[PDB]
Subunit: 256 residues, 4 copies
């Protein structure tokens, strides 16, 4: 008798057992969900990782920059879950920014690199919704992973810019998803350890988080973020869409 009993949910973005999506998938299965997983590039390695999840689930290839993968996705999912069945949830846990746009001077990042990062990190949220909405049930939920980009910070640079774009994309996706009786929301997480001046500033930034968070923040524990995503995939936030839920220990609500 789980929070997600009988729900069919697609989860993208597992690459390691530290991946936020791995914990999302773990909690979702513990709560009764039937999953379809998608992975990028390193499929044999990803299969080895997903073997560590509590239940078996099909793994499909999805490169969000690959138009052919996106064109075939719905059919591939339907084959996996069975004709006449549809998805109740979709989790987007995908991000990438080349090193030039992260860690290197903000100004030295070439647009080619920034563009690739925006494609994967922001545009693909719309891509995946476009592909999947036709196979989603009413009452369904699309959830994307965010971090709060309302203020600039050292190091994350163009990735922050990409999250700013993602939040805007989410609001437009919500308009489209509404036509299908589907919600679209983002979870804005605090820092999670999922793997020199960049490192020093990130350190201060991460140390700041636990001190600002009124309930604390454990950057080694993805479970609170995973549980938040499962809340959004459930029937218990039925009037929330186009929105951002902060799973960050309350840090963004506190100056110090």
């Amino acid at each position: 008798t789980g929070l997600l009993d009988g729900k069919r949910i697609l989860v993208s973005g597992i690459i390691t057992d530290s991946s936020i999506a791995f914990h999302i998938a773990r909690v979702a299965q513990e709560q009764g969900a039937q999953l379809v997983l998608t992975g990028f590039d390193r499929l044999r390695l990803i299969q080895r990782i997903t073997d560590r999840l509590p239940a078996k689930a099909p793994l499909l290839e999805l490169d969000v920059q690959n138009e052919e993968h996106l064109a075939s996705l719905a059919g591939r999912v339907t084959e996996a879950i069975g004709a006449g069945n549809k998805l109740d949830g979709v989790v987007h846990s995908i991000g990438f920014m080349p090193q030039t746009g992260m860690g290197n001077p903000f100004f030295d990042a070439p647009y080619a690199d920034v563009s690739k990062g925006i494609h994967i990190s922001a545009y693909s949220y719309a891509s995946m919704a476009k592909a999947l909405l036709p196979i989603m049930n009413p009452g369904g939920s699309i959830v994307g992973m965010d971090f709060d980009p309302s203020r600039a910070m050292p190091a994350y640079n163009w990735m922050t810019v990409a999250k700013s774009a993602l939040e805007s994309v989410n609001r437009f996706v919500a308009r489209e998803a509404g036509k299908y009786g589907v919600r679209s929301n983002l979870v804005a997480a605090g820092p999670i350890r999922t793997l020199e001046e960049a490192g020093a500033q990130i350190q201060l930034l991460e140390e700041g988080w636990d001190q600002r968070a009124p309930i604390g923040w454990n950057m080694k524990d993805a479970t609170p973020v995973a549980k938040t995503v499962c809340a959004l995939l459930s029937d218990w936030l039925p009037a929330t869409t186009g929105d951002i839920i902060y799973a960050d220990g309350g840090a963004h609500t506190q100056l110090l």
Copy 2:
């Protein structure tokens, strides 16, 4: 299994069966919560409303402007739930602004005495209730208040909107205090509920629609925050408004 199974939760704010608190109480009981209810002024009237709930629940008097009521509250709750038990949740569903501060009356014509009463009941009392109840709350617990988005001005709601702006600020400070107990504090910002142009704009703006006759989605959202499923959220606002606030038109 219920979402709130075994949880002891205090719910304020029931005055009618259209009250948002009534629907919160109903859904919470359906999900296995054991409730303590608080009401203001018309306690016999409120008792008859609470008879409509699926399960029996003790009713305690609480006028949030009454310091003696606040002083005795934890002790009266402990009597209601049993010595050695604590609360897992507190729901603040309390608000009031005199007619001089809402409606047809010009914004400028509300006397400060009326505004101050409104702010006392609608904003400061979120802090008062947390002060009274945190000493009898369990770690992992949750305080939830009812809000509406006050980030932009609108016709009519005038000083009540100002009171909600205050309440949002108050919630952020309550989160700091509640955190010391391992307790979360959050507000649910609801769309309009019948408990007109402004109101019908809502369903138009909301990507998933908005039914102002239906409090259940708001009640479910409150229960989500009372549950263990949003453990990293505090000092925050969850919008149960059909997404209306994310859309311009």
Copy 3:
């Protein structure tokens, strides 16, 4: 040849020559404005202070909790600036919270009577002053209030933060009313301005809060100096921000736009 040449502007909130309002008044006068000043309670002291401004200006008594002061204000201003003349600007630089609601006292230990007084003076009075003065303001005019960013909680500032959240909301409603007169209403959110007394623990918290500002501000923040804030207020009083109302302008070195 000043930014505010010919403008008649009322400036409230001077108590010392470190008051933000003192610097607003100074800059405004340097820029050709003709001022009327309002002061609370210690008018003799305030007269000695306003003797240090670049020009002589009339001083009117205004306790914003005194309804009779508010009822008579427009009349008294009109006497000060001449029959047939109206104001082009109004500066609200008034705030107050008792020590029970701001400082070392725990957030939960502020009684409502104290919080209510603070909200009266710090937030409600922005509406009060707008109500009293809009009938004697020219089209194109400007009402500016002082704010600090209350969107996140912080140590010490406690109920004054709550009062500022209320003020920001009040400002948006004042903008609706002021618009009828062709008048703008805006707030300037300033960084902290110096205008062991709280002990070492709270003293340390506040110093870290203050120093964090200068570190976050991309252009730095000088907490000794109200001039940049005074200039920002004068920008809002001028004709150069003519399509901005109900709004907040941050004069904080950009601190609020940066996380670390």
Copy 4:
């Protein structure tokens, strides 16, 4: 004795005399500024209508060579030994696939990427090129329209503005090292130069009429001067402690729900 007296200011984004940049340039010259203009497309014919002569430099923000040579070309135009006190970014672009009647989901990424390059990334590109020739106390200003909420039609241009707002906050960090401010002006809709059809035309007219209705001081979409003046305020010394920020020149519309 003007607001920008003696200031040397680069203004990009003039294509017609209804361009917001044309109005910014006009007001800036009226206020005593010495301009250098940049354009990319007959533009000299348009810039000839400004009240004073200004050198006009080619700058395609997608062209890396134009960016790499920009500072040197500006220095030659303003004279060795002189630096810029201001820079205005008034540049935006989104293909019709990403903005207008085309469904949100039907914009290919190549089109969206081009739009984000020109509309968002180029704010950083220009700052990079020009900061080394800016005076302390200088000001960089870019044009925005409030993207905090989704709206019909504007679609991926809204996304590009959301990205621009984030870029501005990062440019502020870099610019501060030079004692330079970086801010955006978020304008309400301006009637620059039934093309979209009956249905989407009516949606847009509702979107525009609601703006004047929400604005407590009203909103005249035919008049860019209030926006031009706001830009000049930011270029002036009168907002010396504002950076990484957004100033709304929208009649107050964004502060009101109805």
